[PDB]
Short mmCIF file of C-alpha atoms and ligand atoms in Angstrom, two decimals:
data_model
loop_
_atom_site.label_atom_id
_atom_site.label_comp_id
_atom_site.label_asym_id
_atom_site.label_seq_id
_atom_site.Cartn_x
_atom_site.Cartn_y
_atom_site.Cartn_z
CA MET A 21 167.24 325.90 123.27
CA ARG A 22 164.81 322.94 123.34
CA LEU A 23 162.53 322.99 120.32
CA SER A 24 159.50 320.84 119.68
CA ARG A 25 159.06 319.43 116.20
CA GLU A 26 156.62 322.26 115.40
CA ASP A 27 158.97 324.91 116.88
CA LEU A 28 161.70 323.54 114.54
CA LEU A 29 159.46 323.68 111.44
CA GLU A 30 158.38 327.25 112.24
CA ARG A 31 161.93 328.54 112.81
CA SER A 32 163.40 326.73 109.79
CA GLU A 33 160.58 327.37 107.25
CA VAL A 34 161.06 323.85 105.93
CA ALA A 35 158.35 321.26 105.11
CA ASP A 36 157.50 318.50 107.57
CA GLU A 37 158.09 315.97 104.82
CA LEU A 38 161.73 317.09 104.46
CA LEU A 39 162.21 316.84 108.24
CA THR A 40 160.69 313.36 108.10
CA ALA A 41 163.07 312.38 105.30
CA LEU A 42 166.04 313.70 107.31
CA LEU A 43 164.95 311.89 110.46
CA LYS A 44 164.39 308.58 108.70
CA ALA A 45 167.85 308.87 107.03
CA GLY A 46 169.47 309.48 110.46
CA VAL A 47 170.80 312.88 109.37
CA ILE A 48 168.99 314.85 112.02
CA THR A 49 168.20 313.53 115.47
CA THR A 50 166.56 314.80 118.56
CA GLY A 51 168.72 315.34 121.59
CA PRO A 52 168.51 313.00 124.57
CA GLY A 53 165.17 314.49 125.87
CA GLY A 54 163.52 314.28 122.44
CA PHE A 55 163.88 318.01 121.66
CA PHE A 56 165.61 319.66 118.80
CA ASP A 57 168.30 322.27 119.27
CA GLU A 58 169.38 325.51 117.57
CA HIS A 59 171.71 323.57 115.32
CA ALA A 60 168.73 321.60 114.04
CA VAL A 61 167.36 324.82 112.51
CA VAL A 62 170.52 325.39 110.52
CA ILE A 63 170.83 321.70 109.55
CA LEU A 64 167.24 321.65 108.24
CA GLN A 65 167.69 324.96 106.30
CA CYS A 66 170.91 323.73 104.72
CA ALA A 67 169.36 320.33 103.92
CA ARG A 68 166.45 322.11 102.19
CA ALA A 69 168.75 324.26 100.14
CA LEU A 70 170.84 321.23 99.23
CA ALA A 71 167.67 319.24 98.18
CA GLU A 72 167.00 322.10 95.82
CA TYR A 73 170.48 321.36 94.27
CA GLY A 74 169.54 317.70 93.81
CA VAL A 75 170.97 316.39 97.07
CA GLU A 76 168.50 314.13 98.79
CA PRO A 77 168.43 313.57 102.53
CA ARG A 78 169.79 310.04 102.21
CA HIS A 79 172.88 311.48 100.51
CA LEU A 80 173.64 313.51 103.68
CA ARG A 81 173.68 310.41 105.83
CA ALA A 82 177.48 310.14 105.40
CA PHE A 83 177.89 313.70 106.78
CA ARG A 84 176.16 312.68 109.94
CA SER A 85 178.17 309.46 110.43
CA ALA A 86 181.38 311.55 109.98
CA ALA A 87 180.11 314.30 112.35
CA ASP A 88 179.48 311.70 115.07
CA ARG A 89 182.98 310.31 114.69
CA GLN A 90 184.46 313.83 114.82
CA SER A 91 182.38 314.73 117.85
CA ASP A 92 183.85 311.69 119.66
CA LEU A 93 187.41 312.84 118.79
CA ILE A 94 186.56 316.29 120.17
CA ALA A 95 184.99 314.85 123.34
CA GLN A 96 188.19 312.84 123.94
CA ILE A 97 190.07 316.21 124.14
CA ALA A 98 187.45 318.39 125.85
CA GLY A 99 185.81 315.91 128.22
CA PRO A 100 188.69 315.71 130.69
CA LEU A 101 188.74 319.54 130.78
CA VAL A 102 185.22 319.86 132.19
CA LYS A 103 186.62 319.46 135.70
CA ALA A 104 189.39 322.01 135.01
CA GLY A 105 187.17 325.08 134.51
CA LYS A 106 187.57 327.98 136.96
CA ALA A 107 184.77 327.81 139.53
CA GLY A 108 184.84 331.25 141.20
CA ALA A 109 181.66 333.31 141.71
CA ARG A 110 182.22 334.98 138.30
CA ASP A 111 183.20 331.72 136.55
CA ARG A 112 181.27 328.82 135.11
CA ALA A 113 183.18 325.51 135.25
CA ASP A 114 182.12 324.26 131.75
CA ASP A 115 183.54 327.26 129.83
CA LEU A 116 187.01 325.73 129.36
CA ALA A 117 185.68 322.51 127.77
CA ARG A 118 183.43 324.61 125.53
CA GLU A 119 186.36 326.79 124.39
CA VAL A 120 188.41 323.72 123.59
CA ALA A 121 185.56 322.07 121.70
CA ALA A 122 185.01 325.31 119.75
CA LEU A 123 188.73 325.50 118.78
CA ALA A 124 188.64 321.94 117.57
CA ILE A 125 185.50 322.56 115.50
CA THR A 126 187.01 325.68 113.97
CA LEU A 127 190.17 323.74 113.15
CA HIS A 128 188.19 320.96 111.57
CA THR A 129 185.93 323.31 109.60
CA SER A 130 189.02 325.10 108.22
CA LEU A 131 190.63 321.79 107.24
CA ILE A 132 187.51 320.89 105.25
CA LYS A 133 187.30 324.32 103.57
CA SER A 134 190.98 323.99 102.69
CA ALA A 135 190.61 320.48 101.27
CA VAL A 136 187.51 321.49 99.28
CA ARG A 137 189.30 324.50 97.75
CA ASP A 138 192.05 322.14 96.63
CA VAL A 139 189.81 319.47 95.05
CA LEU A 140 187.61 322.04 93.23
CA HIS A 141 190.78 323.97 92.13
CA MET B 21 194.85 334.72 99.95
CA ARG B 22 198.07 333.20 98.40
CA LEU B 23 200.47 333.04 101.35
CA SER B 24 204.12 332.14 101.49
CA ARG B 25 205.46 329.95 104.30
CA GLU B 26 206.89 333.14 105.94
CA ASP B 27 203.53 334.96 105.47
CA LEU B 28 201.83 331.99 107.16
CA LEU B 29 204.25 332.01 110.10
CA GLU B 30 203.92 335.76 110.65
CA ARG B 31 200.12 335.78 110.36
CA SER B 32 199.60 332.70 112.51
CA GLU B 33 202.16 333.81 115.11
CA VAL B 34 203.22 330.28 115.92
CA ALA B 35 206.68 328.81 116.35
CA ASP B 36 208.42 327.51 113.25
CA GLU B 37 208.67 324.12 115.03
CA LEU B 38 204.86 323.86 115.24
CA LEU B 39 204.38 324.55 111.55
CA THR B 40 207.17 322.13 110.72
CA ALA B 41 205.55 319.41 112.85
CA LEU B 42 202.11 320.03 111.31
CA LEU B 43 203.56 319.83 107.80
CA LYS B 44 205.47 316.64 108.64
CA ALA B 45 202.32 315.02 110.05
CA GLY B 46 200.28 315.96 106.96
CA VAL B 47 197.82 318.06 108.93
CA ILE B 48 198.55 321.24 106.99
CA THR B 49 199.41 321.33 103.31
CA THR B 50 199.88 323.81 100.52
CA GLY B 51 197.38 324.03 97.73
CA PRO B 52 198.00 322.81 94.16
CA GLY B 53 199.56 326.22 93.28
CA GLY B 54 202.21 325.61 95.97
CA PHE B 55 201.11 328.20 98.56
CA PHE B 56 199.03 328.50 101.70
CA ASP B 57 195.59 330.01 102.03
CA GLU B 58 193.69 331.97 104.68
CA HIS B 59 192.42 328.68 106.07
CA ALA B 60 196.00 327.65 106.89
CA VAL B 61 196.32 330.66 109.19
CA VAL B 62 193.26 329.59 111.14
CA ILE B 63 194.36 325.95 111.24
CA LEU B 64 197.75 326.97 112.71
CA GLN B 65 196.19 329.35 115.21
CA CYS B 66 193.80 326.69 116.39
CA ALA B 67 196.50 324.00 116.44
CA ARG B 68 198.72 326.17 118.67
CA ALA B 69 195.88 326.82 121.11
CA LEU B 70 195.02 323.13 121.10
CA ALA B 71 198.67 322.21 121.75
CA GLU B 72 198.52 324.39 124.84
CA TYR B 73 195.60 322.21 126.05
CA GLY B 74 197.35 318.81 125.44
CA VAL B 75 196.79 318.17 121.74
CA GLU B 76 199.97 317.31 119.84
CA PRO B 77 200.21 317.84 116.06
CA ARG B 78 200.30 314.03 115.64
CA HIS B 79 196.83 313.87 117.27
CA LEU B 80 195.38 316.22 114.63
CA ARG B 81 196.07 313.64 111.90
CA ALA B 82 192.65 312.06 112.63
CA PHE B 83 191.08 315.46 112.00
CA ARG B 84 192.94 315.85 108.67
CA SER B 85 192.02 312.25 107.58
CA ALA B 86 188.39 313.00 108.20
CA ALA B 87 188.40 316.39 106.58
CA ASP B 88 189.91 314.96 103.41
CA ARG B 89 187.24 312.25 103.24
CA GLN B 90 184.56 314.87 103.77
CA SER B 91 186.01 317.01 100.98
CA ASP B 92 185.80 313.97 98.66
CA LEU B 93 182.04 313.57 99.51
CA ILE B 94 181.60 317.31 98.95
CA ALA B 95 183.35 317.15 95.58
CA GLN B 96 180.99 314.39 94.51
CA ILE B 97 177.98 316.64 95.24
CA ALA B 98 179.41 319.98 94.11
CA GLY B 99 181.69 318.88 91.24
CA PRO B 100 178.82 318.17 88.88
CA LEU B 101 177.48 321.71 89.48
CA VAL B 102 180.65 323.32 88.02
CA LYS B 103 179.24 323.02 84.48
CA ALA B 104 175.88 324.42 85.68
CA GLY B 105 177.25 327.77 86.77
CA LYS B 106 175.70 331.03 85.56
CA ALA B 107 178.65 331.97 83.40
CA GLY B 108 177.09 334.86 81.54
CA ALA B 109 179.45 335.75 78.71
CA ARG B 110 182.31 333.83 80.44
CA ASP B 111 183.23 330.24 79.39
CA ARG B 112 183.24 328.98 83.00
CA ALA B 113 181.69 329.74 86.39
CA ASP B 114 182.21 327.70 89.56
CA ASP B 115 179.89 329.78 91.81
CA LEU B 116 177.13 327.17 92.14
CA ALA B 117 179.65 324.47 93.00
CA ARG B 118 181.06 326.78 95.67
CA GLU B 119 177.59 327.49 97.10
CA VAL B 120 176.78 323.78 97.33
CA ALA B 121 180.13 323.15 98.95
CA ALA B 122 179.53 325.94 101.51
CA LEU B 123 176.09 324.57 102.41
CA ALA B 124 177.46 321.12 102.86
CA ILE B 125 180.22 322.41 105.16
CA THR B 126 177.75 324.46 107.19
CA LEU B 127 175.48 321.46 107.54
CA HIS B 128 178.42 319.21 108.60
CA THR B 129 179.73 321.81 111.11
CA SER B 130 176.31 322.17 112.64
CA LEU B 131 176.00 318.37 112.91
CA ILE B 132 179.30 318.35 114.77
CA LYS B 133 178.26 321.14 117.12
CA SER B 134 175.00 319.34 117.89
CA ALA B 135 176.73 316.02 118.57
CA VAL B 136 179.43 317.61 120.74
CA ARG B 137 176.86 319.43 122.88
CA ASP B 138 174.98 316.10 123.29
CA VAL B 139 178.10 314.09 124.22
CA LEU B 140 179.17 316.81 126.66
C1 8TU C 201 176.83 327.83 118.82
C2 8TU C 201 178.31 328.17 118.58
C3 8TU C 201 179.30 327.10 119.08
C4 8TU C 201 178.93 326.16 120.28
C5 8TU C 201 180.25 325.36 120.50
C6 8TU C 201 180.15 323.98 121.17
C7 8TU C 201 179.85 324.04 122.66
O1 8TU C 201 179.17 323.12 120.58
O2 8TU C 201 181.39 323.34 121.03
C8 8TU C 201 178.50 326.85 121.65
C9 8TU C 201 178.95 328.30 121.74
O3 8TU C 201 180.12 328.21 122.45
C10 8TU C 201 177.01 326.70 122.04
C11 8TU C 201 176.55 326.95 123.53
O4 8TU C 201 176.26 328.35 123.65
C12 8TU C 201 177.51 326.51 124.65
C13 8TU C 201 176.83 325.95 125.90
C14 8TU C 201 177.85 325.05 126.68
C15 8TU C 201 177.86 323.63 126.08
C16 8TU C 201 179.26 322.98 126.00
O5 8TU C 201 180.07 323.24 126.92
O6 8TU C 201 179.46 322.20 125.05
NA1 NA C 202 166.72 317.07 124.11
#
């Protein structure tokens, strides 16, 4: 989805001032057309909950820098697979790259959960 | 959630060689108690599927590197909340620290999904 700023605030139930803080810290960004996506809703809701635990938007800036680097590693794997999707009537040619990107994200997420478990216990 | 190496191989359904390679490369590890967790099963499952698409275990090292650094940032945010847990009559409670850690991971995952969709 393509959400305006106001659409994002309504869906997230977060204050405009928190969104402004997250934008100015580079944590959240608009997509290339200047809209927000569905992930922005979740990011803003998590950021609000985290602010309530004393974590200010500027302290999430590292998460974003790391996410961008990981996204590039994932694109290296999935990008060349865009052309390899089945293109029959019933197919959509992007599905294979999406599947591969999703596997990589799941892998990565699980690695972080694992590493966190270990450092907190 | 405390899995032996055999439990991990049977649950993940991957070849012994793949696990061996992932261990050697540092991508998968046991916890401090010496065993594997439920996350290891998912990691192995995903790694096998990714291998089928071209991704060698060696190539997953960059993922592991990054995940460890992210866990260190998460520990810095969540670690101080261990002592703030709602222990009740107990001496300890890590539930707040776990919640903060879970939020942070969700946020980070969502940041990745957003960036991937943009790049692709
Ligand atoms: C939200 C759940 C995951 C997310 C995974 C992805 C594409 O970001 O890696 C996907 C679900 O597969 C969101 C979109 O529904 C997929 C549209 C195709 C875009 C793509 O190929 O990257
Ligand atoms: Na956009």
